[PDB]
Amino acid sequence: GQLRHNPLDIQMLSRGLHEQIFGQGGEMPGEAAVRRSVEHLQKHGLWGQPAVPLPDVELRLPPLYGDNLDQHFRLLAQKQSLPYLEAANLLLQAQLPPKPPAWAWAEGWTRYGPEGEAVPVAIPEERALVFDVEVCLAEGTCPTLAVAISPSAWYSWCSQRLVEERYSWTSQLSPADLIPLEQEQLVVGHNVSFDRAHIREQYLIQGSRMRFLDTMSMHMAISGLSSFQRSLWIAAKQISSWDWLDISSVNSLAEVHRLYVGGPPLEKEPRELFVKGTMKDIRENFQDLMQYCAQDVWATHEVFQQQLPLFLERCPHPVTLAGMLEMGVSYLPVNQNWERYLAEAQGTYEELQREMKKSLMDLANDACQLLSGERYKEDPWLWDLEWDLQEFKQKPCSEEEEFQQDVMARACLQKLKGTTELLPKRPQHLPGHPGWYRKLCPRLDDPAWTPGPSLLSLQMRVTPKLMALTWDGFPLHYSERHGWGYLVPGRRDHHGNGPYNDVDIPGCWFFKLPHKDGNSCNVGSPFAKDFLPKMEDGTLQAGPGGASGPRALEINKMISFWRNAHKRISSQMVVWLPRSALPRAVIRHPDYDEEGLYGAILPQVVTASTITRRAVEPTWLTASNARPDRVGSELKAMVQAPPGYTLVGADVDSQELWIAAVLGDAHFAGMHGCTAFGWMTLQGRKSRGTDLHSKTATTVGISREHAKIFNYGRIYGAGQPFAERLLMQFNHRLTQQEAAEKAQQMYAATGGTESEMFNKLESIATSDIPRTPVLGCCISRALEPSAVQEEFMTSRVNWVVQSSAVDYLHLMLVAMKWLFEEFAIDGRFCISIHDEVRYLVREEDRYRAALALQITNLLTRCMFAYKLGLNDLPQSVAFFSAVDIDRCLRKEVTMDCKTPSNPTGMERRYGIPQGEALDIYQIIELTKGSLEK
Amino acid sequence: EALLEICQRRHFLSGSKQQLSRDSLLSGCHPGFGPLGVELRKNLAAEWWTSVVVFREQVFPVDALHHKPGPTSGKLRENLLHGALEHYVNCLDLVNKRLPYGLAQIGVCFHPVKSIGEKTEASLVWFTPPRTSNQWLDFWLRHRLQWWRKFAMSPSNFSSSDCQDEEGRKGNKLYYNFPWGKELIETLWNLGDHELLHMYPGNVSKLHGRDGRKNVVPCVLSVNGDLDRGMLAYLYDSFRKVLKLHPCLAPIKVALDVGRGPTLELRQVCQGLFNELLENGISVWPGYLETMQSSLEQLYSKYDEMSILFTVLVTETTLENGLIHLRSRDTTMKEMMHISKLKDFLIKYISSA
Amino acid sequence: EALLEICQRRHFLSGSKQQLSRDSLLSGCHPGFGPLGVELRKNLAAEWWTSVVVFREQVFPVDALHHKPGPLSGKLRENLLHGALEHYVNCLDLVNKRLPYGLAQIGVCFHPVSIGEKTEASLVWFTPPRTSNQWLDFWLRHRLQWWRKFAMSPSNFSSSDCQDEEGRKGNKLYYNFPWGKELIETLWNLGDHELLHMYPGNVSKLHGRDGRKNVVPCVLSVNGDLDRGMLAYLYDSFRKVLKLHPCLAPIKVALDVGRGPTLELRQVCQGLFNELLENGISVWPGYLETMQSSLEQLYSKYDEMSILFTVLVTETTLENGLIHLRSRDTTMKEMMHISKLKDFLIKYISSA
DNA sequence: GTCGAGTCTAGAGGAGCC
DNA sequence: CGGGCTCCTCTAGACTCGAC
Ligand SMILES: Nc1ccn([C@H]2C[C@H](O)[C@@H](COP(=O)(O)OP(=O)(O)OP(=O)(O)O)O2)c(=O)n1
Ligand SMILES: [Ca+2]
C-alpha cells in the first residue's frame, strides 16, 4: 500500500518514494507532539476535514550517494564546484610580475613575459583569470580592449576596430567580433557578466565548462548592503546603530577595494573616454586606458583574494557556490523575429506617441491665441505659465527684358542677403512665442528638429493644464510641495486628501489627488494607470471631452513600459551565430530557415546582487509578460528556441508560503501540518483553485496575481492600512468600510494561525550569526545583531525566507545539472527568474527534462524537510503542478501573445504554436517513469 | 455646411449650391475641383506615391487606359485592377520574376450613378506569394491606415473593418468617420489567383513567380483608394475659421505681401523672394500683386481659410536690415527672420512635418 | 524601328513586340506606356508645369472632367479648351477680374480614330484684344524655347505660321521625325467667338479689367501633345545609348553591388539608396538582384535606359568609402567618396 | 565685466519583475 | 513597518564657456 498518512491524517509521500528518500529510521513524533498538533488544528477548525487522496506516484529515483539527503546534495555540489575552487585557490596564491612599462598596440591577445616583453598568443591559456573588458560605446557593443591576469602572466587584448580605421564596420555582431577566451576554467570580474557577454565561445548553443565568479556577488554574500543601507552609506560618506559602516561598502570596485584591501585609493580616468568619447580618443590615449584597465584588474584580484576565504566561511555549504556558478551561465536564444519585434514595437510606439503628440500639439497651438488681450489670466489652467515675449536682438516683355528683370531681382535679393553681419551669431530661439510654448519646441540647431511643440508629453506638468483635466469638476493644480491636485472654489480668506494651506491660491482650496500608496505620497502625473478607473467613472475628465482623456490614459498605459525599456531592449547585445556555429540538429530540422538569422542574448546577471543573494538583470528580470494592451510586452515571447529545441521549464508553487509553513511546523512539532497555516498550505490544489492565493482571490474579488501581493505583504509585515489600500486599488467595487472589514478577516487569526512561523523567523533573525535553515549561509555583516542591533528587522525577517528560496534555487540548479549529466539529457540552463527555472532542451528529451524537473522539486522539498528534521514529505507539495514545454518564454503555454505591436499573435505573425503543460502523471505515462533514453 | 461654403469660397470646390451637396460629392457627379482642390489632390497623390512607389523597391508605375476595347462597343474603365492584371506579366521581368512586387497607378475611374461619376483612384496591386498573403494583407492594412492617419488631425476617425466577399475571400475596408457616418475611402481584398488565370488561360508557367526557391502563382492583393473621397475626408478633418491641413498637403505653402511705403522699392524684393521660393519648390501666393489692399486681419483670415502655412511680410525695414515678418497659421504668432534663411526654414518645416 | 524595340524591351512602351507601330503610337491607340515611359511623361509634365504655371501668377490649374453631360446623353471630351472656357467665370475671381490670366491642364483627351487617347498640355490665355498677337508671339517663342531646351538637336523643332478657315492667326510647332515632320503643338488666336457662344447675352459677366476698364477677353489656345512630344524626345535622345536630358530621364542613378560580403554591402547600398531617395534622386535598385551579369552588359542595359550614372559598391567602399562611378554621356569611370555622391548628383541635375 | 545658452547632476514620482 | 530589485522621464539647481 503506497497510501500513507501522518498522525494528522495528511497524505504523506508514497511508500516507495519515502523509502528511497528518507528510509526507515525516522524518529516517531511522540504522544505529546501529536496531542499538541491535534489540539491546535481542532481549535482552528481543521482536524475533522477530510480530503480526497491524490493518486500515488511510483518512481525509481536515481540513486542517492550519501547516507542521507544532505550528504547527497553535498557530494553533488562538491563534484560540481571542485574544479573551480582549485582555480580560485590558484588565483589566491598568485605571484604576478609588475605591469609592463608600455602596452602592446597589436590586435588580439598578447602575453607579457617578465620585464614587460610582449609575446603574441591566441588565447590566454589559463585555468583562472581576472578579466576586465572595455567597450567603446560610441561604436556600439563591440569590445574595444581588455586586460587579464593569471599567476605569472599579464595579458592584453585589442580589437580590429581599435587598431584599424575603416569606413564601416558591421552593426550585426558575430562571434568573430568577440574576445576568444575558451577542462574547466574560472573567470573572475567585478561585473563578470558584462565581460562574459563579450566572449566568443559563450554564444554557442551547446554549453561550455567555463564558469564565472563575480566579486560583486561575493561582496553581497559577505558584507553586502541593502538599498536603504546603500543610501545611508553614501549619505554618510559625503537609526542609532552605525557600526555596519566600517564593515560594508557599495558595489563599486573602488569602494570594495577600500573595504577589503584598504590600500591607496583607486584612480579612474577623468575623461571617461569609453563612455563618452570617439574611437580616435581611445587611439590617442591607448596607454592610459590600458593602464587604468590593468589597475581595475589588479584591484579585482586583490579583492577576490580578500573575499574568497570570507565567502567560504560565511557560506560553507557547497550547494551555494555550485548554484552561484550555475546561475551565471544564462542563455536566451533569438532569431530574426527579434529584429522584427524591435522594429514593430518601435513603429507602434512612434505611432501612438505621434497621435498623443498630435493631440497635445493641437491643444498647445490653439492655446497660444490667449496671449492676445491677456486672456490667459482668465484661463483656470494656463494662467500660471510664463507668457513673456522676448524682443528681437541686433548688434508682354522681350527675352532680354525678362532676363534683365530676373537678374535685377536676384541681385537685389542677394544685396539684402549680405546684411547677416549685423545679425547676432547666436540664433535666438523663438522670441515671438510665449516662454511656456518656447520650452516645448526643439531649437533649429537640433538635428532631430520637428515642427511645432514636439517636446510635449503627458508626463510634463503643462499637459494636464493644456488638456484642462478636472477632478470631480475642479481644475487640476500643481503644488511643488504636495504634487498634483485640484482647486475647489469657494475660499473667502468637499472631502478629500486634505485642504493644504501651503498653496495660498486666492479663492481656492488645494486637495491632493488620491494616491494608491496613501496620503504620505504625492501625485506627479495625473495620467497614471490608477486613474484610468477614475477617468472611466467620470471623476477625472478632459476639457475637449469625448474620448480625449480616456484615449490619453489608454495610450499612456500602452506605451508606458516601452518608454522606460526601449533603450534596454533595443541595446541588447545580440550575437548572431553563422551557419557553421549552429548544431547539425538545427540545420537538418524541418523548421530551419535558410535565410533566417540565429543568435542568442547572454543576460548580464549579477548572481548575488541582493542581501538575500538574489540575481539581478536590468532587462530580463524586468521583462514584462505579454498583455493585450501593452506595447512590446511580447519581449519574453521573442526568446524562441531554435529548430529541434524546446524550452522546458517550471515554476515553484507557493514557494515562500510553503517555506514559512514548514519552518513553523518544524518549530512547533516534528510533523507536517502541525500548525494551522501549514495544514492550510498542504490542503489545497491549484488545479481545483483551492490554494491560498486562489482562496484569497475568491474571498476578495482581486486577481490571483494581486492575491500574491496581498498574502506576501501580510506575511512580511504589511499592516492593515496597507491591506485596505491594496484591496481598494485592486478591487474598484469596494468601499472604505468594506476594505477595512475584509482586511480584518484576512488578519483576524494570524497563539495564531502563523504564530510559530513568526517565532521561528524572529529567532533565526535575532541569533548572533543568522544563518539559512537549509544550507547554513550566513547573513551579511551589515545586518548581524552586533552591527545593527534592532534595525532593519523586517529586512532580516524577510531575508530568512528569501535566502531560503535562493537556497531552493541553488538546490534545483545543482540537481538539474546532476540529472542532465548522469542521464545525458541534451539540454542546458536557459534562465532562472528567481523561482522560475527554464532549460533549453531538444525535442527528443523534453519529457525526460520534465521528469527530471519533477524529481528535482521532490528532492528539494525533501531536503527542506530533512534539514528541519521532519523525516517525511506531504504528497501535495511533492511535484510541480505543471511543467511547461514551449518553444518561447511565456507565463502560460496556451496564451497567444497578442499585443498592440503583435495583434496577430505568435501563431500567425510567427510560426510558434501553443505549448503544453504536463503534471507528474502525464510525464510518467510519456516516459515510463525513467529518465533513461 | 460651413465647410462647403469655405471650400467653394476659397476655390477648393468649383460649383454652385445646386451641385455642392453631400450626395453629389460622394457619388462623383459634382463638377470639377477648384484650383486649390486640384493642388490639394496633387499633394495627396504625391504623398501616396512617396509612401507606396518611391520608397518601395518592388513597386513600379503602370499605365492603364481609360477605356477597354473589344467585347458590340467598348466601355470606360470602372477600376484600375484590370490594367494592372494585364501588365502583371510584362512587369514580372523588371523584378526578374521575384515576388512580391506591385503595380501602382493613380487615375480617374468611371462609375454609373445613368449619370457617370468620375472618381480619381489610387490603386496598388500586390502579387504576393500564397503562404504570406495574409501577412502581406495585414501589413498593407496597417501601412495604409497609418498613412491615412499620418496627415490626420484626428487619426481615430480613420478605422478599419474585416469583411468577406460572396466567395468568402478575406479583406479589409477602411473608413473615414464623416459627420454623417462612415464612408468607404479605401478597400483591400485578398483575391486569389483565379482572376489572373481567367485573364491568362492556358499554361501557368508564365504566371509563376519566385517565392524564395520555389515558383508559385501569386495571390492578388488589390488596394484601391478613393483620392476624391480622401480629399473630402481631409477637408472635414482639418475643419477662428481655419482649415488646418497638413503642411505636406496644404495647397499653397506661403504668402507674400508688401507692408508700407515705398510701394515700388519693396516690389523688387518681393519678386526676388517669390522667384527664389518657386525655384526651391515652395508654392507661393502673390498677395503683393493685389491692388485692393486690405487690413492685415482680413488677410490673415483669408489665408487661414486657404490653409496658408506662413505669411511673409516684406516691409521697408527689410530694405535696411533684411528682416521680414513671418506669421504661422498654427500659432498665429509673429516672428522676425532674415531673408538669407527663409528658404531653408520653409524647406525644413515642410520636410520635417 | 530599333528605338521602338529598345523602348519595348526597356519598358518605355507596353505590349508585345508586334503590338506597337508608328501609326498606333501617333494616333494614341497603343496599349499604353511602360513604367519608364510613364516616368518620362511625368517628367515632361512637371517640366511643362514649371515652365508655364510655376513662375507665373496669372496661370492657374484647371480641372475639366473627361465627359460633357447634357444635350450636345453624354460624350467624352475631345479638347481641353471647353473646360477652361466653362471655368472662365469661376477663375475670374482669383485675379480680381484682372486680365490677362490663363488656365493650364495636362489631361487625357479622347479622339475618334477605334478610340485614341492623347495626353495633351493645354493653355487657355485670356488676353485683352490689343496685345493678342504680341502674347501669341510671346507664347510661340517660349514654347519653342522650351521644346528646344531639352533637345540635343534643337534644329529638329520647327515652327510655321498658319491660317485657319476663319482667317485667324495661328502658329504650329513641329518635330522632325526620321520619317517626316509631325505636329506636336499648335497655337491659335481664337478670339471671343467661343466665349460668347458658351456665354450668350449679359456680357457684363464676361467683362474684366484692362487698365481700369472693363473689356471682354480674347482667348489664346496653346495645345501640345505630350505623348507625341515624349516620342519626339525619345527619338532625339537616340552604341545603344538614350541620351535623355537629366531633367527628363526617368531613373537617374543605378546602384549595384560588387563581390562579397553580401549583407554588409547590401546594408551600405540600402542606406545610400534611402539617402538618394530622400534627396529626390531616383535610383534603380540593382543591388537586390541576386543574379549578376557582366559589367559591360550591365552598362549597356543602363545606357539603353536613361540612366545618368552607375554606382558600384565593393569591399573597398567598406575600407575607405570610394564608389565606382560611370557617366552615361562619356564612357569614363572615376572613384568618388560615398558621402559626396548625393551632392555631385544634385549639382549635375541643377547644372543641366 | 555681465550675462545667457549648454551641461552635468541629484532628487522625486512612476512603473516593470519575483 | 511587505520585502528584494531595476530603470526611466522631468525638473530644479549649480557650473561652464563664449559673446557683447
Ligand atoms: N509581490 C511579490 C511577488 C513575489 N514574491 C516572492 C514570494 C514568492 O514565493 C516568490 C515567487 O513568486 P511567485 O509569483 O512564483 O509566487 P508563488 O510561487 O506563490 O505563486 P505561483 O504559485 O503562481 O508560483 O517571490 C513576493 O514576495 N512578493
Ligand atoms: Ca512561483
Author numbering:
A (entry chain A): 67 to 248, 262 to 317, 342 to 498, 532 to 629, 733 to 989, 1051 to 1233
B (entry chain B): 67 to 137, 177 to 218, 229 to 354, 369 to 482
C (entry chain C): 67 to 138, 178 to 218, 230 to 354, 369 to 482
What's in the article?
Whereas most mutations are rare, a subset of three amino acid substitutions, A467T, W748S and G848S, has been identified in about 70% of affected patients. The A467T and G848S mutations are both located at positions that are distinct from the catalytic sites of POLγ, and structural comparisons revealed that they do not affect the general architecture of the enzyme. The A467T mutation does not affect the folding of its α-helix and although G848S is relatively close (approximately 5.5 Å) to a backbone phosphate group in the DNA template strand, it does not directly interact with the DNA. In their stalled, elongating conformations, the mutant forms of POLγ—except W748S—displayed lower affinity (increased Kd) for the template compared with the wild-type enzyme.
Mammalian mitochondrial DNA (mtDNA) is replicated by DNA polymerase γ (POLγ), a heterotrimeric complex consisting of a catalytic POLγA subunit and two accessory POLγB subunits. In addition to its C-terminal DNA polymerase domain, POLγA also contains an N-terminal 3′–5′ exonuclease domain that is crucial for proofreading during mtDNA synthesis. More than 300 mutations in POLG, the gene encoding the catalytic subunit, have been linked to severe, progressive conditions with high rates of morbidity and mortality, for which no treatment exists.
